[PDB]
Design a protein around this ligand. Sequence first.
Ligand SMILES: Cc1cc2c(C(C)C)c(O)c(O)c(C=O)c2c(O)c1-c1c(C)cc2c(C(C)C)c(O)c(O)c(C=O)c2c1O
Ligand SMILES: Cc1cc2c(C(C)C)c(O)c(O)c(C=O)c2c(O)c1-c1c(C)cc2c(C(C)C)c(O)c(O)c(C=O)c2c1O
Lengths: 113, 43, 56, 859
Amino acid sequence: DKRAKVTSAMQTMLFTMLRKLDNDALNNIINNARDGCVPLNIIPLTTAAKLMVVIPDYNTYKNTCDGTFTYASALWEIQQVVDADSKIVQLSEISMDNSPNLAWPLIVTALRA
Amino acid sequence: TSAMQTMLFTMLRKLDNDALNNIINNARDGCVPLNIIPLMVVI
Amino acid sequence: KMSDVKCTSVVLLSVLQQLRVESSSKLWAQCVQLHNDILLAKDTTEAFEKMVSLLS
Amino acid sequence: VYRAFDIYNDKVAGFAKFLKYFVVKRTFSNYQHEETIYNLLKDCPAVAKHDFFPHISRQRLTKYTMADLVYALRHFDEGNCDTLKEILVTYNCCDDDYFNKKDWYDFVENPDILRVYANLGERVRQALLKTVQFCDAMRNAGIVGVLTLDNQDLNGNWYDFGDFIQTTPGSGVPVVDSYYSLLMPILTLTRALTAESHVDTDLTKPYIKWDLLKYDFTEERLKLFDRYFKYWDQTYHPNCVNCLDDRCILHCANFNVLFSTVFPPTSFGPLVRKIFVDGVPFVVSTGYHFRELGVVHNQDVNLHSSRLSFKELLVYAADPAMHAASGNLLLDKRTTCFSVAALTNNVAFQTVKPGNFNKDFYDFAVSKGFFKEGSSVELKHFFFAQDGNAAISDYDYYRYNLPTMCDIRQLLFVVEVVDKYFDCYDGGCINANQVIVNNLDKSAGFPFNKWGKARLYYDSMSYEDQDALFAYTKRNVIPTITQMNLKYAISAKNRARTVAGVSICSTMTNRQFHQKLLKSIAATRGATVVIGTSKFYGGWHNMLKTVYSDVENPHLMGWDYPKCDRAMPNMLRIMASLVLARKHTTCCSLSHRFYRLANECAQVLSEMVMCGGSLYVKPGGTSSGDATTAYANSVFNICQAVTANVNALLSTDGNKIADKYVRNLQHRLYECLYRNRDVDTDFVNEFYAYLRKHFSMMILSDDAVVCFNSTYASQGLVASIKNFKSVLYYQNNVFMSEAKCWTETDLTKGPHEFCSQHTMLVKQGDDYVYLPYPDPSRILGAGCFVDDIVKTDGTLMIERFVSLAIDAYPLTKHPNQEYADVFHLYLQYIRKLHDELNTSRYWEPEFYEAMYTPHTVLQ
Ligand SMILES: Cc1cc2c(C(C)C)c(O)c(O)c(C=O)c2c(O)c1-c1c(C)cc2c(C(C)C)c(O)c(O)c(C=O)c2c1O
Ligand SMILES: Cc1cc2c(C(C)C)c(O)c(O)c(C=O)c2c(O)c1-c1c(C)cc2c(C(C)C)c(O)c(O)c(C=O)c2c1O
């Protein structure tokens, strides 16, 4: 009996991930090409707007993602930011002074601009 | 784990808690800091 | 007597993990650093220092 | 004046460090012919200048030619490492003072050596393009020739003419297999043609900002070939879907794997068209651009799949299409491995805990005289505990997995010598109920493990359904999602454990494809591989007996591969899978066989990996948690071995040798693999025999022991200890320190270690038998450190103690007493344990006696 449940869960997860994406910019890319064969290592790179970056320490938070930013040839204004302990962080703290006092992996939740 | 203290008795029987003794010493010099110093000190 | 010190450090790390101290990151990182360095012990006094520093 | 060379004359056919800018010579007709050919072929921009003044000299030649480079890479010795060092320094990768980093040569410590190495890929690609220029100059000057490697300096301008014979112009074909094959798998270490990812294909320029849709590169890859391998006299099929049966795929995936670099990583992996299932524009995968295989267009394609049932739901859910595409894009700066996305919108971490310690055991030890100030048996192994960044720090290590080729005219001996090493076995594409399910509650892949283990699926998919899936695999492709968790178990080191539960589907196909061969290896005895053998009853004893069936002076010895399940190279991991299938040529269409190979080389060599929530791309390695993995790397172990023996034979001047049989074994094995193409059953049979004679091997699941004539190796004939390492280096991308490999030189004692065991010689029944015993400290630690829950019912712990005592009973007979008291305490322990509640009474020494004397017959 459980076989029905798990086979159902396959395409259920499928269709709901579809809805979580379902859009037309995706359709805007599919027509720009041939019958459809396009690398899957590009789809979320374009038709997604919820970039999540895990920043390990200070010296990369300076040469990389900062306080809006551009990545994947787009624009990203940093939304709510959280540290490795799932706690909220304010951007002023990220500097050489207070750096040794925050949970290091800094997970950002940027949006597309 | 309640036996932790049981084995800490035999531990203390041959250790004298060297660093804890150093901390109680720093407390004995009247230099009791505002907080325990990582294993501030005032005056 | 490194045997007793290694066993004591193991049971101490066990009760520490049971205490649910996994909130912070650097504290538990250094804690397991001390634990990994006391389970690999060549001298009994070095293990003594790591054990006493970890006890608090 | 000693360098590398390549020779195959009538008699000496070898590849060894034979002893022999303006290199002056010392013949009249030969240098006359050399001058004539130089005067016919000089107007190509790939030929070093010459000088006919009997001195046929050269000019502008790097002191070390391409040959010595390929050699030094192929035969590396941290002891004798002059050449690799000198080359890496003279050609601007780092200065000689870089040779102080402890473990500089390594690939795990000092991974900067990767950049150091890639500092020569340009110097390589240059000579490569020069070589293609030279091939065209030859074909359009009409000469028949041979292409070695000792004749081209590190710049590239070839030289050393005077060997061929004048043909008529426009009609000339040179023998190239020696060149491109020996030189084959270094074009990847240095990453040669990476320059061709730029707009003018030059570093001093931006990268080609390839359309974010261009997928095939078929014309581009063929440009790559017609520009680099236009002279590979075999119908290179861009996609190996057009290679005939099997020997041609090993020849062609060995080219897609090279061209896989110049293209963005944003281009490989699956191919997702957009199917409108009742309109809904599902962007599912209907193709795959494998790095090593090619543009496999899934032949079967189904639009408007109005209804759906188990098969297609699973077929599609296994894809990364509906996750990668339709998921909140995720970036992760911790690693270097490429990332995709995240299921849920919050990164996760997992910390490991320490294993519980058994107090009563410690009390028994201290009281009965163990745990004392200087006991010869100390403690070394414990259940560690890991910190937060564990799963991801576990994942990071894959950075050792450089993608590499493997010499294809050499590897066109060993697939079949191993075919022999498994000849005595069964094998076929059996049907469903012909697959006995072993290891049920093991695991499942990302979508799958959220719903159960492999058992629920093998309960789901009826026979005909799995056969439908098998046919699919014979004509489709599906990629899959592993899930690399962390494992908790006792050890001595301070690293972490890695369990990788692959998809249910890769299993439910590879079982159908291999179970017959599996069982047939799990029921042989006296074989070479020894997986599934009995464990007791003279088991080890009779095993060793086989091992020295007819050996000369048994200097038995074993080994270990540094980080086998990660640094597992590319072409070898294919060869293994292909050898594992020649047991099908009475049931499967060679097309079915290619598409099956594709399904595997997708679900294993590179696929999706849920690392917490961060879907990366597995750049290689080997799924530890895979069934066929064990016998697979057993094939890989034999491959490494057989190879070592090839490199040994060729690495030994036949001239100085006075023996005559193996001489004309080596020369004709050269003829076998490098000069011809068709399988020559005579020589594969003869050589397989000769191996079964002088190099008897005992191969357990990725575990090895060998017994070998020592006299042959003194002059150099079979696998020594150093050759098997010099090869491991340049083909596996890891490094095996000689200190971590042993050599027992007196068979009176057993092997120093096999399967983590030492073996003694006792007089049970007044008989010289061989008994293996464990490390006492290992058993001790396993004692007072409980892994699972046992406090409820110690049943499993009791059985753990029993197994320990069964391992320990060969200490009772050990010379040292303390060792025996180990068993004694274990015994008395179990005595108390059973008390709390002869041959059923395991609390008697005779039970443990029964399960070791080499003639018992029972359970
Ligand atoms: C099944 C499993 C799934 C896991 C998953 C799923 C939901 C995908 C995680 O997501 C995850 O994070 C895990 C990590 O903690 C995680 C995990 O550890 C295990 C696991 C465990 C706990 C014990 C096992 C035992 C013990 C009784 C000792 C075996 O004897 C044994 O044979 C196993 C193998 O089959 C075996 C095993 O696989
Ligand atoms: C105890 C035992 C004794 C055996 C003996 C005795 C009489 C000496 C044989 O003579 C013999 O031939 C055996 C066959 O190999 C044999 C045997 O297999 C086991 C055993 C095994 C292999 C695996 C177990 C596992 C795995 C799945 C990891 C569990 O998870 C587990 O819980 C177990 C405990 O119940 C468990 C288990 O008991």
